[PDB]
């Protein structure tokens, strides 16, 4: 079949017009500016209520509330200021893998190895949290969940397919099928018009929410990738793989922009998050400690060494007050 | 500090409930069940009272067992196996009457080798069950066993063929000083696997208690 060499030459042509536009890297333009210096963050709070390995968490839009889930079979809502527990929701399938928080603050999402994404309603007239919906239709474990609006939700599953749903009816409004492995993470754009996902294929895909078709493909990693986040401007994103390296890609240029890695680290990445000004990049490792890099100069700015096991989840508030890290140690900590 | 006291009281009540649930969920035995294609994994479930992950609950001599079966969900096993780190035991199931079918026992041995040498399971015990013994009794008297084991040299009958298979199982784990493998022979009838599971779990728990106190 000539289709094999046709696709090969098409890929060659794609890679042809991907380095002609790379006249210079991010460096040699950012070398003139002064460095950040030293970042000395301290553990302001320590949230200690979980009795198992914490797997994911999410920040509220008001930057005071958060939600966290572990293998204990419960997910709980933390008041990040006074260190108080607002809600404690026990879920049926204890094999949790992800969490999400509605931008309106009314709903929360979950989902793990039970192939089902559960939607819970926080603000009811009966005083308790009750499960509002059970999205079913995936054949693999739910890896990530993000909220688009109060009624829409995009989910990633360990069955190679992503799905944009409609919570009102419960049916898959759109299905995204373009990978060959398992999709691990997910991130939404600031305007919620498009999103990006990354898979065990060591590749990431840019999906348009409306048309439901992949726009661009990004490669460059060597192993399974586990974390995705957008730049605050929405024109770039960052990835972290088992390769013990992270890297930032550009949407407009459509290739790798700059990688962050060091010789000492040999353990893979588990989480990625950015900062409001887009100057420093967080990164959670399996070394039991997380690092803070200068996003422009690619320099180790700080180390938030405060955990006993690998850090599994990591988040930064919307107003930039603090950064929260959660690990298998069963304690999640706030740094400012 | 005016109506924050009620919030503190609510948080304390939530803490009490979480602590009680965690204490209740720590004295309950959790076993992870693995098998193969038509290897009898569903067969052993019948003797006990009894989507992607299947959970079975049962009780024996005032002891609560939760068996987790992961055969339904198919995906990259590397990406979700560590969720089961810390289980009390791994119940492995092998079909004894698949030596000549197709190759099957070679795949079963490859899977046993892969699962027995995981960094997450470097200190976990394995209870191995061998099914289809009754059919294996007369499946070997009409066909040589050398088909699956060309380097074998022994008389073709059940009594030492079963022993050869059992000894072939034990030569896979490299953590001989850290974990102990329990092997049993059973059929569809002769319901005595529950005693074997109970005894293996008792031994594992005793060893863990001995390791806790500084001994062992």
């Amino acid at each position, epitope marked *: 079949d000539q289709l094999r060499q046709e696709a090969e030459q098409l890929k060659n042509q794609i890679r042809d017009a991907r380095k002609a536009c790379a006249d210079a890297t991010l460096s040699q333009i950012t070398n003139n500016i002064d460095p950040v210096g030293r970042i000395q963050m301290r553990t302001r709070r320590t949230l200690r209520g979980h009795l198992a390995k914490i797997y994911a968490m999410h920040w509220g839009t008001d930057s005071r509330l958060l939600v966290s889930a572990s293998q204990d079979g419960k997910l709980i809502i933390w008041d990040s200021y006074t260190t108080n527990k607002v809600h404690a929701i026990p879920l049926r399938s204890s094999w949790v893998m992800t969490c999400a928080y509605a931008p309106s603050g009314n709903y929360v999402a979950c989902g793990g190895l039970d192939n089902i994404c559960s939607i819970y309603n926080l603000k009811t007239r*009966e005083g308790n949290v009750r499960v509002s919906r059970e999205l079913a239709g995936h054949t693999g474990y739910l890896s990530c969940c993000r909220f688009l609006d109060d009624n829409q939700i995009v989910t990633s599953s360990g069955d190679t397919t992503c799905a944009l749903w409609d919570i009102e009816t419960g049916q898959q409004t759109t299905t995204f099928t373009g990978h060959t492995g398992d999709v691990m993470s997910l991130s939404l754009a600031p305007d919620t018009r498009l999103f990006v996902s990354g898979a065990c294929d060591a590749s990431a895909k840019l999906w348009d929410v409306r048309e439901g078709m992949c726009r661009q493909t990004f490669t460059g990693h060597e192993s399974d990738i586990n974390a995705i986040c957008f730049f605050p401007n929405g024109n770039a994103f960052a990835t972290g793989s088992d390769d013990a390296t992270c890297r930032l890609f550009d949407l407009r240029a459509d290739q790798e922009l700059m990688t962050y890695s060091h010789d000492n680290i040999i353990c893979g990445i588990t989480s990625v998050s950015f900062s409001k000004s887009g100057r420093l990049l967080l990164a959670g490792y399996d070394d039991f400690n997380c690092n803070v890099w200068d996003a422009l100069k690619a320099d180790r700015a700080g180390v938030l060494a405060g955990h006993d096991n690998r850090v599994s989840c990591l988040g930064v508030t919307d107003d930039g007050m603090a950064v929260a890290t959660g690990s298998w140690d069963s304690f999640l900590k706030i740094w400012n | 500090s005016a109506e924050d006291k*009620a919030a503190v009281e609510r948080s304390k009540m939530i803490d009490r409930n979480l602590r009680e649930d965690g204490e209740k969920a720590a004295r309950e035995v959790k076993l992870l069940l693995l098998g193969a294609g038509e290897s009898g994994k569903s067969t052993i479930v019948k003797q006990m009272k009894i989507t992607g992950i299947v959970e079975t609950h049962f009780t024996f001599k005032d002891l609560h067992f939760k068996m987790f079966d992961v055969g339904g969900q198919r995906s990259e096993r590397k990406k979700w196996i560590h969720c089961f780190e810390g289980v009390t035991a791994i119940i492995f199931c092998v079909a004894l009457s698949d030596y000549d079918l197709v190759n099957r026992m070679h795949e079963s041995m490859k899977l046993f080798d892969s699962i027995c040498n995981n960094k997450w399971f470097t200190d976990t015990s394995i209870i191995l069950f061998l099914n289809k013994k009754d059919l294996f009794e007369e499946k070997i008297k009409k066909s040589p066993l050398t088909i699956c084991y060309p380097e074998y040299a022994g008389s073709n009958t059940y009594e030492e063929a079963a022993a050869y298979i059992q000894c072939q199982f034990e030569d896979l784990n490299k953590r001989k000083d850290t974990k102990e493998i329990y092997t049993h022979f059973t059929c569809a009838t002769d319901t005595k696997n529950v005693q074997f599971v109970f005894d293996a779990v008792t031994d594992v728990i005793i060893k863990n208690n001995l390791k806790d106190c500084g001994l062992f």
Partner: single-chain antibody
Amino acid sequence: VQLVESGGGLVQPGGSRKLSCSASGFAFSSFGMHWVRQAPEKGLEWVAYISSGSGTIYYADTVKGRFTISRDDPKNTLFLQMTSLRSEDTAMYYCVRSIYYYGSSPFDFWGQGTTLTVSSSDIVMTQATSSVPVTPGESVSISCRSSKSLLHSNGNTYLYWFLQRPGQSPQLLIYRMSNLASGVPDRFSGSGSGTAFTLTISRLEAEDVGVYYCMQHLEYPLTFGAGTKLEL
């Protein structure tokens, strides 16, 4: 969601009474419960409070040592035992649910209450006016005053504005002096500063007539205002 009170009626002076409040439709075990009374010709008056889990009990000076509160979670009821009744206890009693966490709206749902007829350092809340006649379709503003600043150091003011319609139980209009309750039209609003608060209603419509009340939740006891009667 509903709360039904029972046990009221005629009580001889110095007697005893046992008032019940049955809840249905919500999780009674996660709600603190208040008893609040209103005289036949006066405003409301906070009476007693019991927390979630029976941890805390609060009374007022007039009731301490005579009124005790209790609850039964499995049976989902609230109970008030009253001893040595005086003529000052002639009132109408309301069983109010209230839940406290970050962002909650306490004092939202009130029961129908029961009548009780007997034969024969606190923060001061004041209302400037006792009656305001206004034709429908206009905008009205009503002022409440306090003897102390209600702005806590954390950054919120614990002021509550309620309405009682003629022949109806009260309901929450705005909580914490700037937040509108649920099931309330957006035309209502509230504002103010330390010891001076104003509730403003725009585009007045029918059924808005009644009595407005201002109350503080800075410390116990909670003190009620005089209430302004808005009538045509």
